[PDB]
Coordinates of C-alpha atoms in Angstrom, one line a residue:
Chain A
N21 CA 0.0 0.0 0.0
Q22 CA 1.8 3.1 -1.4
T23 CA 0.0 5.9 0.6
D24 CA 0.1 4.7 4.3
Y25 CA 3.9 4.2 3.7
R26 CA 4.1 8.1 3.1
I27 CA 2.5 8.5 6.7
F28 CA 5.1 6.0 8.0
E29 CA 7.8 8.3 6.4
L30 CA 6.0 11.4 7.8
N31 CA 6.0 9.9 11.3
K32 CA 9.7 9.0 10.9
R33 CA 10.8 12.7 9.9
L34 CA 8.9 13.9 13.1
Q35 CA 11.3 11.6 15.2
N36 CA 14.2 13.8 14.0
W37 CA 12.6 16.9 15.8
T38 CA 14.8 18.4 18.7
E39 CA 14.0 21.5 20.9
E40 CA 16.7 23.3 18.8
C41 CA 14.9 22.8 15.5
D42 CA 14.9 26.0 13.2
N43 CA 11.8 27.4 11.4
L44 CA 13.8 26.5 8.2
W45 CA 13.6 22.8 9.4
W46 CA 9.7 23.0 9.4
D47 CA 9.9 24.6 5.9
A48 CA 12.0 21.6 4.8
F49 CA 9.6 19.0 6.5
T50 CA 6.5 20.7 4.9
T51 CA 8.2 20.9 1.4
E52 CA 9.0 17.1 1.6
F53 CA 5.3 16.1 2.4
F54 CA 3.0 18.9 1.1
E55 CA 2.4 20.5 -2.4
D56 CA 3.0 24.3 -2.8
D57 CA -0.8 24.7 -3.1
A58 CA -1.7 22.2 -0.2
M59 CA -4.8 22.9 2.1
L60 CA -5.1 21.5 5.7
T61 CA -8.5 21.4 7.4
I62 CA -9.3 20.5 11.1
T63 CA -13.0 19.9 12.0
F64 CA -14.0 19.7 15.7
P70 CA -18.6 21.7 14.6
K71 CA -16.1 24.6 14.0
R72 CA -14.2 24.0 10.7
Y73 CA -10.7 25.7 10.2
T74 CA -8.8 25.5 6.8
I75 CA -5.2 26.9 6.4
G76 CA -3.2 27.4 3.2
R77 CA 0.4 26.0 2.4
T78 CA 2.0 29.1 4.0
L79 CA 0.7 28.2 7.5
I80 CA 1.2 24.4 7.4
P81 CA 4.8 24.7 8.8
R82 CA 3.4 26.8 11.7
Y83 CA 0.6 24.3 12.4
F84 CA 3.1 21.4 13.0
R85 CA 5.5 23.7 15.0
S86 CA 2.5 24.9 17.2
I87 CA 1.9 21.3 18.4
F88 CA 5.5 21.0 19.8
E89 CA 5.6 24.7 21.1
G90 CA 2.3 23.5 22.8
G91 CA 4.6 21.3 24.9
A92 CA 4.7 18.1 22.8
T93 CA 8.0 16.1 22.4
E94 CA 6.7 13.4 20.0
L95 CA 4.0 13.4 17.3
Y96 CA 2.9 10.3 15.2
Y97 CA -0.3 9.4 13.3
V98 CA -1.9 5.9 13.6
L99 CA -4.2 4.8 10.6
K100 CA -6.4 1.8 11.4
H101 CA -7.7 0.2 8.1
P102 CA -7.2 3.1 5.7
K103 CA -9.0 2.9 2.2
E104 CA -6.6 3.7 -0.8
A105 CA -8.3 4.8 -4.1
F106 CA -6.4 6.0 -7.3
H107 CA -8.0 8.8 -9.3
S108 CA -6.9 10.7 -12.5
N109 CA -5.6 13.8 -10.6
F110 CA -4.7 12.3 -7.1
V111 CA -4.5 9.2 -4.8
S112 CA -7.1 9.3 -1.9
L113 CA -6.5 7.9 1.7
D114 CA -9.7 7.7 3.8
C115 CA -9.3 6.4 7.5
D116 CA -12.3 6.7 9.9
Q117 CA -10.3 5.3 12.8
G118 CA -7.3 7.8 12.7
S119 CA -5.3 8.7 15.8
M120 CA -3.2 11.9 16.3
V121 CA -0.8 11.0 19.2
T122 CA 1.5 13.4 21.2
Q123 CA 3.9 12.8 24.2
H124 CA 4.2 16.0 26.4
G125 CA 6.9 17.5 28.7
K126 CA 8.7 15.6 31.5
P127 CA 7.0 17.4 34.5
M128 CA 3.5 16.6 33.3
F129 CA 4.7 13.4 31.4
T130 CA 1.1 13.0 29.8
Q131 CA 0.0 11.6 26.4
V132 CA -2.9 13.1 24.3
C133 CA -4.7 10.8 21.8
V134 CA -7.0 12.8 19.4
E135 CA -9.2 10.3 17.5
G136 CA -11.2 11.1 14.3
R137 CA -11.5 10.6 10.5
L138 CA -8.4 11.6 8.4
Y139 CA -8.9 12.2 4.6
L140 CA -5.8 12.8 2.5
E141 CA -5.4 13.5 -1.3
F142 CA -1.8 12.8 -2.6
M143 CA -0.3 13.9 -6.0
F144 CA -0.4 10.8 -8.3
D145 CA 3.3 11.4 -9.3
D146 CA 6.9 10.4 -8.1
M147 CA 7.1 12.6 -4.9
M148 CA 3.6 11.5 -3.6
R149 CA 3.1 14.9 -1.7
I150 CA -0.1 15.8 0.2
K151 CA -2.6 18.0 -1.8
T152 CA -5.4 17.9 0.8
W153 CA -5.3 17.2 4.6
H154 CA -8.8 17.0 6.3
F155 CA -9.0 15.7 10.0
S156 CA -12.5 15.5 11.5
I157 CA -12.0 15.1 15.3
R158 CA -14.6 12.8 17.0
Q159 CA -13.0 12.2 20.5
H160 CA -10.2 13.9 22.6
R161 CA -8.4 11.7 25.2
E162 CA -5.6 12.8 27.7
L163 CA -3.8 9.7 29.4
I164 CA -1.8 10.4 32.6
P165 CA 0.7 7.9 34.1
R166 CA 0.2 5.6 37.2
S167 CA 3.3 7.3 38.8
Chain B
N21 CA 14.9 1.8 4.8
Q22 CA 13.8 -1.8 4.0
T23 CA 13.7 -3.2 7.6
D24 CA 11.6 -0.7 9.6
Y25 CA 9.0 -1.1 6.8
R26 CA 8.7 -4.8 7.8
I27 CA 7.8 -3.5 11.3
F28 CA 5.2 -1.1 9.7
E29 CA 3.8 -4.2 8.0
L30 CA 3.8 -6.2 11.3
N31 CA 2.0 -3.4 13.1
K32 CA -0.6 -3.4 10.2
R33 CA -1.4 -7.1 10.4
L34 CA -1.9 -6.8 14.2
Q35 CA -4.6 -4.2 13.3
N36 CA -6.6 -7.1 11.6
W37 CA -7.0 -8.8 15.1
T38 CA -10.5 -9.3 16.4
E39 CA -11.6 -11.2 19.6
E40 CA -12.9 -14.0 17.3
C41 CA -9.3 -14.7 15.9
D42 CA -8.4 -18.5 15.6
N43 CA -5.1 -20.1 16.7
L44 CA -4.6 -20.8 12.9
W45 CA -4.7 -17.0 12.4
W46 CA -1.6 -16.6 14.8
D47 CA 0.1 -19.5 12.9
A48 CA -0.5 -17.4 9.6
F49 CA 0.7 -14.2 11.3
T50 CA 3.9 -15.8 12.7
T51 CA 4.5 -17.6 9.3
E52 CA 4.4 -14.2 7.4
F53 CA 7.0 -12.5 9.7
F54 CA 9.2 -15.2 11.3
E55 CA 11.5 -18.0 9.9
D56 CA 10.7 -21.7 10.8
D57 CA 13.9 -21.6 13.1
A58 CA 13.2 -18.1 14.6
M59 CA 14.3 -17.3 18.3
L60 CA 12.4 -14.6 20.4
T61 CA 14.2 -13.4 23.6
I62 CA 12.7 -11.0 26.3
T63 CA 15.2 -9.5 28.9
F64 CA 13.8 -7.7 32.0
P70 CA 17.9 -9.3 34.8
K71 CA 15.7 -12.5 34.0
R72 CA 16.3 -13.6 30.3
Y73 CA 13.6 -15.8 28.6
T74 CA 14.1 -17.3 25.1
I75 CA 11.3 -19.1 23.2
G76 CA 11.6 -21.2 20.0
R77 CA 9.5 -20.8 16.8
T78 CA 6.8 -23.2 18.1
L79 CA 5.8 -20.8 20.9
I80 CA 6.1 -17.4 19.0
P81 CA 2.4 -17.6 18.0
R82 CA 1.4 -18.2 21.7
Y83 CA 3.6 -15.2 22.9
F84 CA 1.7 -12.7 20.7
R85 CA -1.7 -14.4 21.5
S86 CA -0.9 -14.2 25.3
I87 CA -0.6 -10.3 25.0
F88 CA -4.3 -10.0 23.8
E89 CA -5.5 -12.8 26.1
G90 CA -3.8 -10.6 28.8
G91 CA -6.6 -8.1 27.9
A92 CA -5.0 -6.0 25.1
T93 CA -7.1 -4.9 22.1
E94 CA -4.3 -3.2 20.1
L95 CA -0.5 -3.9 19.8
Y96 CA 2.0 -1.8 17.8
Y97 CA 5.9 -1.3 18.0
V98 CA 7.4 2.2 17.7
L99 CA 11.2 2.3 16.6
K100 CA 12.9 5.7 17.3
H101 CA 16.1 6.0 15.1
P102 CA 16.8 2.3 14.3
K103 CA 20.3 1.4 12.9
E104 CA 20.1 -0.9 9.8
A105 CA 23.2 -3.0 8.8
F106 CA 23.4 -5.6 6.0
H107 CA 25.6 -8.8 6.7
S108 CA 26.3 -11.9 4.6
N109 CA 23.7 -14.1 6.3
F110 CA 21.1 -11.5 7.7
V111 CA 20.0 -7.8 7.8
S112 CA 20.3 -6.3 11.5
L113 CA 17.9 -3.7 13.0
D114 CA 19.2 -2.2 16.3
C115 CA 16.9 0.3 18.2
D116 CA 17.8 1.5 21.7
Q117 CA 14.6 3.7 21.9
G118 CA 12.1 0.9 21.1
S119 CA 8.4 1.1 22.5
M120 CA 6.0 -1.9 22.8
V121 CA 2.5 -0.2 23.1
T122 CA -0.8 -2.0 24.0
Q123 CA -4.4 -0.6 24.4
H124 CA -6.4 -2.6 27.1
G125 CA -10.2 -3.5 27.7
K126 CA -13.0 -0.9 27.8
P127 CA -13.7 -1.1 31.5
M128 CA -10.1 -0.2 32.6
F129 CA -9.4 1.7 29.2
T130 CA -5.6 1.9 30.1
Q131 CA -2.5 1.9 27.8
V132 CA 0.8 0.1 28.7
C133 CA 4.1 1.5 27.1
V134 CA 7.0 -1.0 27.6
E135 CA 10.3 0.9 26.6
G136 CA 13.6 -0.9 25.9
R137 CA 16.2 -1.9 23.2
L138 CA 14.9 -4.1 20.3
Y139 CA 17.4 -6.0 18.3
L140 CA 16.2 -7.9 15.1
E141 CA 18.0 -10.1 12.5
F142 CA 16.0 -10.5 9.3
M143 CA 16.7 -13.1 6.4
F144 CA 18.6 -11.2 3.6
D145 CA 16.2 -12.7 1.0
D146 CA 12.8 -11.8 -0.7
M147 CA 10.5 -12.6 2.3
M148 CA 12.6 -10.5 4.8
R149 CA 11.4 -12.8 7.7
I150 CA 12.6 -12.4 11.4
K151 CA 15.5 -14.8 12.3
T152 CA 16.2 -13.2 15.8
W153 CA 14.0 -11.1 18.1
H154 CA 15.7 -9.7 21.3
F155 CA 13.8 -7.1 23.4
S156 CA 15.8 -5.8 26.5
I157 CA 13.1 -3.9 28.6
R158 CA 14.4 -0.8 30.4
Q159 CA 11.2 0.9 31.8
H160 CA 7.5 -0.2 32.2
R161 CA 4.8 2.6 32.0
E162 CA 1.0 2.2 32.5
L163 CA -1.0 5.4 31.4
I164 CA -4.6 5.8 32.7
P165 CA -7.2 8.3 31.3
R166 CA -8.2 11.7 32.8
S167 CA -11.9 10.3 32.8

């Protein structure tokens, strides 16, 4: 499956993040995975859509929100090829973040993730739509 | 990176698990990912090693222990090709499990994971060694 491997790669680049990561690093990350005309939409029923120029700031904001790790889990995603793009539709999608040492908490935002990738060599994200269902904060036993 | 993609695939097959999964299903899962002469070692400093014939029972035991999900996260794994096998060495390896609805807790066993894969077409696991450092149980805010 060609598409969910792009999300494996996206999760892997986010592992390279340190607290000493430049704004030029987020530009390089975004340029690797997103088209120059990419649109990212978060749905809570308040719907917010950001253009390509803010996608780097979106991902940075999550870490500057306190997060140390960020990875996406896609349970049974449906891949379909179209003339213009490849679609990835996942109802059971999880956005997971590990937070600072003092709090040492994990946030698991569950919802539907819909992605349209360019049907070319780079396989960059054209559309990112995440419709959030549930919001879970897990705290340790210690 | 050829090896950590095998662990992406291993995580993906474990998503297909339901509570109505036969013992023949675990034989099929193990046959996909492990050689017929595979060895699996867990280190806590009590060291236990199981042969190929018990590897299906090991993975089943985790779910029959109450777990609904099981996936492995490998942070910066080192891949090296040798004459006989391909090696995957990950100091920052995480074994993650989501537990039953009543408790609704998540266990995150952290440690070093060392894997030797067959340097052939199937890329099946010859050696599985997981040296556990820390053991974390996360409970929800609700």
